[PDB]
Design a protein around this ligand. Sequence first.
Ligand code: VP8
Lengths: 300, 237
Amino acid sequence: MNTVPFTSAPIEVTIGIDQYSFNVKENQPFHGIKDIPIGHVHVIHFQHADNSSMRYGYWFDCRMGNFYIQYDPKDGLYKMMEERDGAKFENIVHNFKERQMMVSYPKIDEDDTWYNLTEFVQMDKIRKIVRKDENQFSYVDSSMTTVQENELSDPAHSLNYTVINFKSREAIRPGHEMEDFLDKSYYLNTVMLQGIFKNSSNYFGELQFAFLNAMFFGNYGSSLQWHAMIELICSSATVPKHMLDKLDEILYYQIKTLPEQYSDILLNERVWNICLYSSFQKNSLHNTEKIMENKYPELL
Amino acid sequence: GAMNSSNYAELFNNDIKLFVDDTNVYRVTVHKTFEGNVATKAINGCIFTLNPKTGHLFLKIIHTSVWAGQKRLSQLAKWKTAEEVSALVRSLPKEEQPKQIIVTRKAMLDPLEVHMLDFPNIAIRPTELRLPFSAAMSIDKLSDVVMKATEPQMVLFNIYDDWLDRISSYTAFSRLTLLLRALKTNEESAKMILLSDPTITIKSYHLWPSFTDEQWITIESQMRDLILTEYGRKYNV
Ligand SMILES: CCOc1cccc(B(O)O)c1
């Protein structure tokens, strides 16, 4: 179990770590979060009590270094930093735990939720989408635009998701216009999976990461990307059976975790109705269709 | 974006543009089978591609053989249309290629956009005008070349005959659309109007009769009356 220690909590803020959120009060005894499960990426995110504008946060993996949080009163935010002095870090964390100055990551032992949301997400791939190679962790916030969004404005602060565009020369073979527009299997299997992602695990990892940035930060371009990657699969007549089964599980846990009160802004009615009821894969997503119909029947 | 009554004079400016109408591409007769089921039989069709400024009509004849062994023919027809429009554009010298292509039905937008990805600078637009180009097959010389075709074929016409010698494109287009609207609403009455007077003939190299300016005004008025009549007979006014 690993630890994200704070230097202190000077401004009132809602802190989240993966699917958990808690409030920390204006000058309250707080030195961080302990008992963080090793083996998964994690995200620690912030929403200031006084300006809920800009949710922001950090993706990190404790196996890649010792990370802490320290408020910066000049830039006005909680910043993640790496401690290179390993002995110093352990001493600090120890000292902190002794004084019970930390909240406990409360992992129900029955609960596989976070694994199921992050199964294919890798820090190395996050760092290629979020370009800031001097840090081992990645900053994301509510307002960062995607490369594709910037095509339709600071390149260094963008989310470099794989561009998907169904009316593009990449998507459409000369001479197979109707075939390739109505059945996206060429774009999915040859262009994206064989060509770009190399395998379905990398494709699913980007899909999961896009969903999590949409949900945790309200990042609109991430929501677009999540839906585009779903639609590309469901709109392909030829998809490896193992990918369809895994997609159903992925989407199931994403819909299960989505806050009910956010469904209005995080779910695209057209994409979901097409995917579940009109697409080539309309009958391949049994678990996802069941939770959608029982939890969000209004959208449909 | 879309083309409507607000931006109607744009049709007659000096940016090359084409209308594409696909309503006569896939044409069938529905009939009973010996077993009392219903079946379709296709007949030849055409793509109606028109430059509204010049009157040039690129009539691509769609021979029934193109449907042989194919499924979902009404959807294929839109993609075949887009393929042929794209082939026409590629065949034209760069200085003759259109800057915009306006489709008369919104279901043609995605097929044409996909076929034309190589031409990112050509705008593909819908229109809110309900244009009567479906009635092109009520022009006897166009219907005749379509039905006699034994293979795919493109035929070029000027749908304005020699009118531009005497009137503007705007007026020529208004005349054309009035004639086609009438032919669409009551073909027999429209044709009677057009051919009643045996002293006014259709030149071998024309589509419409050789009316004087005065006679065209008479004709145009009679075509309005007809459209008003049928609107009366239809709605009981
Ligand atoms: C990781 C810290 O998790 C906490 C601590 C206290 C309360 C809550 B909660 O569910 O709102 C969460």
